[PDB]
Copies of this chain bind each other. A is one copy, B any other.
Amino acid sequence: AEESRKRLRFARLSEHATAPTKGSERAAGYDLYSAYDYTVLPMEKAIVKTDIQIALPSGCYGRVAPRSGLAAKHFIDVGAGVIDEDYRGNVGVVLFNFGKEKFEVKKGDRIAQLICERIFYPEIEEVQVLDD
Contact = CB atoms under 8 A, between A and B. Distances in A.
Contacts of A132: 55, 86, 88
A6 B122 contact: yes
Task: Name, among A21, A53, A131, the residue most crowded by chain B CB atoms within 10 Å (CB to CB).
Answer: A131
Nearest to A42: B79
B118 A99 contact: no
Interface in A80-126: 80-82, 86, 88, 94, 96, 98-100, 115-118, 121-126
B79 A75 contact: no
Contacts of A122: 6-8, 57
A21 to B, nearest CB: 7
A20 B124 contact: yes
Interface of A: 4, 6-12, 19-22, 26-27, 29-30, 42-45, 53-55, 57, 59-61, 63, 68-69, 71-75, 77, 79-82, 86, 88, 94, 96, 98-100, 115-118, 121-132
